[model samples]
Target: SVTVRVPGKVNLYLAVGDRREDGYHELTTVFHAVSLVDEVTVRNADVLSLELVGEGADQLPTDERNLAWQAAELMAEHVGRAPDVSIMIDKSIPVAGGMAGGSADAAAVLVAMNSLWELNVPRRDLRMLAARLGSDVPFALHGGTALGTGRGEELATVLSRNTFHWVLAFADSGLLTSAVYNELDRLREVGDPPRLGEPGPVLAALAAGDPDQLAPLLGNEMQAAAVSLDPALARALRAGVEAGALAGIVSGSGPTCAFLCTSASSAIDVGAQLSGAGVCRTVRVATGPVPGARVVSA
Candidate 1:
């Protein structure tokens, strides 16, 4: 048996730049991996099975729609052997909170298959495979701080030693990525949404390693989509700030609001305030940029 680890992601700044020719949107943003994670265990089974638990269980499918299952099938096609594997996902990351849970699961599939099948594929090769699976999958393959462009899959590594503290307010409702992107188009058709700021300053703050500095620099371009999808998110956003969070923004195509707090204690305080406000269904706190997905045990 073999084992590896993967990390959850936080968008320090994510901006959907424009609609693309390929029916995908052009995006430029700063991404960071956080401590909350999904752990996968791959072992022998009579038939392939994926068991989902934790934050987004209902949303995760058991069939081919499941990114993990897709990844396993993709590996089977590559290796020319049907895998009799059992997959167990200990999910800590939010489901529809836009924290990239599916991407993380898919990444685990690549790592596990590489180790289990002895495919001898390197990280770069697997990352390319990851890219094909989804735009966000590649970044989940190599978690840390980086710049994401070209539908958010074209990743270029950069220096960022900073860790950020986040308190997440998870909503009962799930926000689908495709839905959010489409909503952006609808909103654009109706009226102009505010364009998000650039990634340069946010990148600089990550390298600087100060929450004092990073807090001011954090942002996301998809805030409009998230807010449009759930107008109540504005109330959630305001609650976080009103509770003394340094800064707050929608996390990805969020119904989940992420607030940047000055410290763990500050995050705790912010969390307590939000919890009292009852603006969300769930809440989690994490600090980042953490490592990428890898096989933990096999």
Candidate 2:
């Protein structure tokens, strides 16, 4: 059996361009890999099977419809064999929280399958397959800080110094990523909402290792749409700030909010305060810049 662990992502800076004829929007964003992760284990089996056990596993499919299953099939095709491994996911990231939990699992499976088969696949080739799985999948395979463009698959690593502390605010319910984008489209068609500028300042702050500088520069183009779709998120943001977070923003699509704290201790304090505020379902403290998917066991 082989096991691989991958971290979920948070977009420190996300700017979306107008929709193109392909029905896809060009995105300029910085992706940070948080400690929240999912672990996938693959072992020899007579049949291709999947089992999920953790976090939002109940809501996720454990079959071909799932990204992990697709990842296994893709790897098998590339390896010229039938997909006959049992895949199990130890999930910790929230489902549909805009955290790329699904992408991380898919990435883990690719890494695990490569190792299990001793395929000796090159990283770039694996990333190519990852890109085919999903835009975020590539990033999950190459975590840290990166500039993502063109559906967020094109990645360029950005220099980041020091670790960043975060407090994740999870809602009792999850939001569909598609629905959030649809809301953004509707809002844009109806009226102009405030949009984020370039990511230069945020990138600079990250390189400087100053959370204070990064605090004010944290921006997301989809924030207004996220808040619009779920008004309670605004309250949660206010509560996080009230609890002493330096800044807060919707993680990606909608629902889950990420609060930047001064330090790990600061994150804990803010999480403790926000937990009792009745603003969100739960809160978790995590740090970023964790490495991407890698073998945990073999």
Candidate 3:
């Protein structure tokens, strides 16, 4: 058996480009892995199975529909073996919260099964398999800080300094990723919404290790669409800033908002204040640039 822990992600800079012929938008994003994570344990079994527990577990599917299950199947097929594994998930990342919670699980399964099965598949090949699982899955395999392009699958490591403290506010309900993209398309077709510029400044701030410099530079193109889909998210965004965060932005295609803080203590204080504000269902404090999916126990 193997237990793998995977960190969730936040897009410090996400710029959505024009929709392509493939029905996917061109994307340029900076992915930062946070401390919030899920634990996936896998053991040999006669047949493939999954057990889910913890945050939003009741809302998730345990069958092939689950990304983690798909990951197990994909890995097994790659190595030409039956996907005979019993997988259990202990979740912490919010489901469908634009933090790539599902992608994290899938990444965990890939890493865990590799050890459990002793396939010795190289990290590069595993990443290729991960890309097939989802655009975000690959990043979950290569966590830290990265610049992503080509629908967020192509990745290049970004030089980052200092640990960034954050406060994440989760909504009562999640907005579908597809729905958020569709809304962006509709908004663009009918009206002009602001688009993000190049990520140069954001990258420079990260390299300098200054939260004050990085805070104001955090931007997400999908924020308008996300806010349109969930108007209450606007209040949550404002609340974070009011609670003394250096800055706050919608996390990816969010109903979840991420707030950058001056320090860990500041993040905790902001989280407490935001929790009391009642603009979000829950609040969590996390630090970014954590490792991706890796074996924690075996």
Candidate 4:
């Protein structure tokens, strides 16, 4: 048996271009993994089964439709063996909150199964499998911070020199990613929304390892669409700022809002104040530049 831990991601900078025939838009974004994580435990069993625990576990599918389940199946096929392990997930990342919670679990499965079975799959091969599961899966596998381009799969590791504090405000409800993208298309057809020009400055700010510099440049192209879809998020962002966040942005295709804070103590202070302000369902304090999926126990 082996247990693997994977961290959820937030897009510090996301820029989306026109949609392609394949139904994905070109994206330029910086992927950063936070401390909030989900754990997947794999144990030998008579046959394959998935059991989910923690945070909306009842709502998640345990069947093949689940990405984590699919990941298990994919690994089994690669090794030409029947999946005979019981998979249990200890989830903490919010579901459908644009935090790549699902992808994180899928990445955990791949990492765990590889170790449990001793398949000795190379990182490149595992990453190839991860990409097939989802665009975000590849990033979840690598974690830390990276520049995600080409539908967010083609990644180059970004130089991150500092630990950054964050306050994540999870919404009462989750937003559909497809719905948010459709809203983006609709807005583009009718009127223009301000777009993030390039991510060069964001990269530079990260290299400098200064939260103050990065805070002001935090931008998301999908924020307008996300805010349009969930007006409550706009209020949440405002409230986070009011609660003393240096800057707050709609996390990816979020209903989950993330605020940049100066330090660990400052993040806790911001989260405490935001919880009292009543703009979000819950608040979490995390530090970024964490690693990707890796075995924690065996």
What does candidate 1's lDDT look like per residue over 224-298, in tens digits? Answer: 887877789888898999998988888777776788888888888899989988999987788777778866565
Model 3: per-residue lDDT, tens digit, 235-264? 888888988999999977777899999999
Candidate 2, 198: how far from true, in Å? Answer: 1.0
Candidate 3 lowest-lDDT run of ten: 150-159
Q: How many clashes show up in model 1?
A: 11
lDDT of 2 at 47: 97
State model 1's lDDT: 0.79
Model 3, residue 30: C-alpha shift (Å): 0.9
For all predicted structures, in order, the TM-scores are 0.89, 0.94, 0.94, 0.95
Cα TM-score of candidate 3: 0.94
Clash count in backbone of candidate 3: 0
Q: CA shift at 58, candidate 2, in angstroms?
A: 2.2
Residue 283 in candidate 1, Cα distance off native in Å: 0.6
Off by over 4 Å in 1: 18-24, 176-179, 182-192
The per-model lDDT (C-alpha) reads 0.79, 0.88, 0.90, 0.89
Model 1 misses residue 190 by how many Å? 5.8
